[PDB]
Amino acid sequence: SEESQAFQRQLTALIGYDVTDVSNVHDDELEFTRRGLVTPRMAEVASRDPKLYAMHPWVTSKPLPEYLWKKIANNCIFIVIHRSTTSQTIKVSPDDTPGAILQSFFTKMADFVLRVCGRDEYLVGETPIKNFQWVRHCLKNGEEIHVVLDTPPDPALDEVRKEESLWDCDRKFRVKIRGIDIPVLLTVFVEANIQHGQQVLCQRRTSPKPFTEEVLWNVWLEFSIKIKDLPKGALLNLQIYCVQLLYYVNLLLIDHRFLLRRGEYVLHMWQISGFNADKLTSATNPDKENSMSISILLDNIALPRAEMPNQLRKQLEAIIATDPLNPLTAEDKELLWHFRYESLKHPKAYPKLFSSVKWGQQEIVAKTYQLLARREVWDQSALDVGLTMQLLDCNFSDENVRAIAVQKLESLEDDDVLHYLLQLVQAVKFEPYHDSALARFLLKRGLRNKRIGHFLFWFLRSEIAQSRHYQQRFAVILEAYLRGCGTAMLHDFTQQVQVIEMLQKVTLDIKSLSSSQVISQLKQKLENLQNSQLPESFRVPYDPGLKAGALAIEKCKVMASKKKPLWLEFKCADPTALSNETIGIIFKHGDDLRQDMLILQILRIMESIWETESLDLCLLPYGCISTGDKIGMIEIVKDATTIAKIQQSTVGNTGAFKDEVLNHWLKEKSPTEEKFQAAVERFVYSCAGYCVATFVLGIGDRHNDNIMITETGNLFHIDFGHILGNYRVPFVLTPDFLFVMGTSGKKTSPHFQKFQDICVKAYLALRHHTNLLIILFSMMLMTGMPQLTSKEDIEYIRDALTVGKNEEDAKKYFLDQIEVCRDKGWTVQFNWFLHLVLG
Numbered sequence: 001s002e003e004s005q006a007f008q009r010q011l012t013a014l015i016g017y018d019v020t021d022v023s024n025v026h027d028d029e030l031e032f033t034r035r036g037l038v039t040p041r042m043a044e045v046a047s048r049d050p051k052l053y054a055m056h057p058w059v060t061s062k063p064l065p066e067y068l069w070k071k072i073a074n075n076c077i078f079i080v081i082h083r084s085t086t087s088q089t090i091k092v093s094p095d096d097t098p099g100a101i102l103q104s105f106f107t108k109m110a111d112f113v114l115r116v117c118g119r120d121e122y123l124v125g126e127t128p129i130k131n132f133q134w135v136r137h138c139l140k141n142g143e144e145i146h147v148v149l150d151t152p153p154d155p156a157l158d159e160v161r162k163e164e165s166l167w168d169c170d171r172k173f174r175v176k177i178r179g180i181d182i183p184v185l186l187t188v189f190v191e192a193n194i195q196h197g198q199q200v201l202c203q204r205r206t207s208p209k210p211f212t213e214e215v216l217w218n219v220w221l222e223f224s225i226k227i228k229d230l231p232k233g234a235l236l237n238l239q240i241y242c243v244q245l246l247y248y249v250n251l252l253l254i255d256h257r258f259l260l261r262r263g264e265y266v267l268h269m270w271q272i273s274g275f276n277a278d279k280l281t282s283a284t285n286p287d288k289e290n291s292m293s294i295s296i297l298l299d300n301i302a303l304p305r306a307e308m309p310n311q312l313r314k315q316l317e318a319i320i321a322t323d324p325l326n327p328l329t330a331e332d333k334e335l336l337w338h339f340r341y342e343s344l345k346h347p348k349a350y351p352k353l354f355s356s357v358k359w360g361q362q363e364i365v366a367k368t369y370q371l372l373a374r375r376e377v378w379d380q381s382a383l384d385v386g387l388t389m390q391l392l393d394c395n396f397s398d399e400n401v402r403a404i405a406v407q408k409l410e411s412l413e414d415d416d417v418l419h420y421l422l423q424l425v426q427a428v429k430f431e432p433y434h435d436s437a438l439a440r441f442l443l444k445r446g447l448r449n450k451r452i453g454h455f456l457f458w459f460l461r462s463e464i465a466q467s468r469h470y471q472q473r474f475a476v477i478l479e480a481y482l483r484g485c486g487t488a489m490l491h492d493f494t495q496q497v498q499v500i501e502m503l504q505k506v507t508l509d510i511k512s513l514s515s516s517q518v519i520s521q522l523k524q525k526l527e528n529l530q531n532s533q534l535p536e537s538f539r540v541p542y543d544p545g546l547k548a549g550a551l552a553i554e555k556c557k558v559m560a561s562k563k564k565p566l567w568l569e570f571k572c573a574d575p576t577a578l579s580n581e582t583i584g585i586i587f588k589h590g591d592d593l594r595q596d597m598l599i600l601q602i603l604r605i606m607e608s609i610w611e612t613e614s615l616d617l618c619l620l621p622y623g624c625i626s627t628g629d630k631i632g633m634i635e636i637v638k639d640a641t642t643i644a645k646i647q648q649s650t651v652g653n654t655g656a657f658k659d660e661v662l663n664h665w666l667k668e669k670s671p672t673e674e675k676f677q678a679a680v681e682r683f684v685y686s687c688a689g690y691c692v693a694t695f696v697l698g699i700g701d702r703h704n705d706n707i708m709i710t711e712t713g714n715l716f717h718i719d720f721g722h723i724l725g726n727y728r729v730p731f732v733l734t735p736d737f738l739f740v741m742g743t744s745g746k747k748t749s750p751h752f753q754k755f756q757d758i759c760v761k762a763y764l765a766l767r768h769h770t771n772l773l774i775i776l777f778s779m780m781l782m783t784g785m786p787q788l789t790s791k792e793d794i795e796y797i798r799d800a801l802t803v804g805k806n807e808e809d810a811k812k813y814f815l816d817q818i819e820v821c822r823d824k825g826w827t828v829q830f831n832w833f834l835h836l837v838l839g
């Protein structure tokens with residue numbers, strides 16, 4: 001078709017990569033997968049309720065926590081319905097359905113849908129109003145709940161554009177190397193490995209030859225594994241050391257069709273930088289003008305109850321009970337396997353057990369499967385995500401094991417799927433194949449909920465636009481989602497992309513020039529754009545509810561830092577919006593906004609752990625979307641400053657920090673005094689919040705420049721990309737912080753103990769999720785952190801969370817940590833000032 005060519009040009013510029021382009025491919029896997037997704041995509045589209053999908057209610061089944069119940073007047077919530085101009089303030093019960101809140105109207109001030117004013121959120125379908133996210137957001141931050149009444153949007157706008165044996169030869173496996181060759185340049189050798197999720201099964205080397213632009217061997221490297229002892233998901237890792245490694249590449253030996261790989265391959269290899277998830281990618285380096293290559297040939301076949309002691313039991317229970325990161329001696333691993341039927345009665349163990357498998361052995365594998373048919377306890381166990389993520393990481397490469405974890409994630413409601421989304425997406429870099437339970441899961445879920453679908457889009461787009469190792473695979477998943485999400489959404493994503501592409505040119509261009517002149521160019525270009533370049537409005541990608549209209553040009557300015565971020569403001573586009581509080585977004589280049597993303601996502605997780613215990617530690621995990629490479633957008637938190645700049649009030653050229661200043665500033669910026677006291681509380685709550693979390697994530701030692709506070713009390717950290725991209729005190733708890741809590745020095749106050757009492761309830765609440773927190777951290781480093789991966793980097797968290805220790809020992813350690821701060825006072829900050837501002 002013609003208006004089908006049309007499409008594949010559109011997608012190709014939403015996606016940001018051309019999924020039809022076949023050069024950088026040595027087989028039809030992406031194609032196969034492109035085709036493969038078509039049935040789970042269509043199936044989900046043919047399944048959604050067109051109404052409930054049109055209005056995308058943001059809803060939760062979690063128990064409405066205490067702190068919010070308490071903030072109630074008496075089983076009585078106030079809702080201010082608007083319409084033309086006038087209002088109406090109905091008294092309603094938290095348990096009242098939104099359909100019913102009209103039987104409190106069609107029979108009160110004497111069909112219609114209820115949209116949150118100024119947002120694209122709707123209160124609909126059978127849920128107790130207590131259960132809507134926006135309601136909860138209103139009860140905490142204590143605003144009123146305003147709603148416009150209007151027409152349901154037309155479900156027909158979510159219209160989708162139509163379209164239609166190896167278990168025998170006991171041959172030892174072998175690899176003919178031919179040789180290697182590289183555009184422009186010693187001693188050198190191919191190293192070949194046969195791997196299954198980090199378990200390295202076999203291994204050979206080549207005889208070191210002089211290092212020249214072409215080096216040939218014609219060797220048969222013969223392996224010790226047998227053609228039938230090969231497992232689906234086995235990679236042939238090829239590497240080139242010269243002794244240091246310089247280049248890598250991988251190839252599956254069992255292709256996506258269950259067929260052993262045959263024939264002739266020439267592969268463009270990946271270079272090194274300056275472990276991580278890119279050394280695992282089945283994708284070859286697109287750059288050919290410059291990439292090192294390796295030539296190979298392939299052989300010239302399809303893949304188809306005892307008792308127990310009383311001390312071994314206690315060796316097992318120890319083993320099972322240990323954290324995810326503690327390694328297992330061969331002695332440990334032989335034990336798990338032997339008593340595997342008993343090992344299966346505990347979900348907690350599946351990781352460790354499935355790691356005890358000798359995957360390079362055909363019969364072991366089968367008994368493994370035999371085990372998996374006896375999966376009962378698991379299928380029945382209450383879903384635990386930390387455990388479930390574990391089976392999705394780089395260690396597990398059996399499709400079927402990975403599959404049991406993904407079946408366990410099917411049981412997550414959308415609220416929860418939004419919490420873990422970013423890590424689940426990253427988790428795709430660990431899938432051996434392109435088409436997996438995990439990718440389809442992500443697919444279904446995005447196609448079933450515009451909110452999830454919105455973020456899925458940016459997450460995938462983010463990886464695509466900067467990962468050369470995963471773009472293809474990700475590009476195929478994106479396209480699958482685009483072809484099923486409705487032209488409504490489709491057209492909506494298009495506006496979004498146009499704008500943010502517009503805005504990056506500006507960012508990078510302003511960056512190129514470096515001052516009074518500049519202010520002008522900025523203003524010049526920003527009105528160059530409010531014509532027929534910029535469309536009239538667009539959704540905010542970090543918050544899909546917010547319609548941004550016109551660029552509030554005056555307020556837009558360029559900032560004062562090494563990187564010259566563009567501070568922008570946006571008139572809300574929605575006229576039902578009961579305020580003029582513009583939308584603030586910062587466009588930055590030069591920092592790994594990704595790293596920020598991962599951290600923030602863990603921040604939002606910590607909050608929803610403290611909530612399981614009616615604890616609210618007042619975090620501000622501001623919206624952050626990475627758009628490209630060292631480039632993206634950040635949400636602006638209103639009415640905030642940097643702690644360094646509050647210090648700069650009373651000195652700049654120096655920062656001879658004074659302890660009085662912050663509490664002066666709060667008093668200075670507090671209207672009544674009922675407020676000032678709340679503000680001081682929110683500080684104490686926020687500050688304790690960041691103190692713990694910052695601590696556990698091991699990005700606690702920062703400098704006041706990177707710490708902000710709102711005019712209303714709330715403290716929060718920013719610019720995570722900085723230290724994680726570059727990398728003593730455990731965390732910033734300065735004297736000026738103390739002074740506010742009412743303790744100049746080594747005294748004590750009813751506010752400080754409040755604080756110190758909060759950190760502990762806090763520090764102990766997370767420890768109930770040791771495993772979870774550990775695995776996420778482990779993953780975040782593999783997927784997002786370059787080089788600072790070692791292994792001892794990972795183990796950092798094992799210390800912080802203090803694996804092994806009982807609750808009491810645990811309270812002591814965090815209190816100690818609070819002490820190194822009381823000790824060091826201003827030292828470290830003053831050290832940073834030296835370093836950062838001058839040294």
Ligand SMILES: CO[C@H]1CC[C@H](n2c(=O)c(-c3cc[nH]n3)cc3c(C)nc(N)nc32)CC1
Pocket residue numbers: 559560561586596622634635636637638639640642718719720
């Ligand atoms: C020069 O003046 C600066 C202007 C920009 C300010 N700034 C940031 O840099 C970052 C941020 C997040 C990651 N990198 N940067 C976040 C940030 C947030 C969330 N809110 C606000 N109200 N300002 C922020 C900081 C002061």
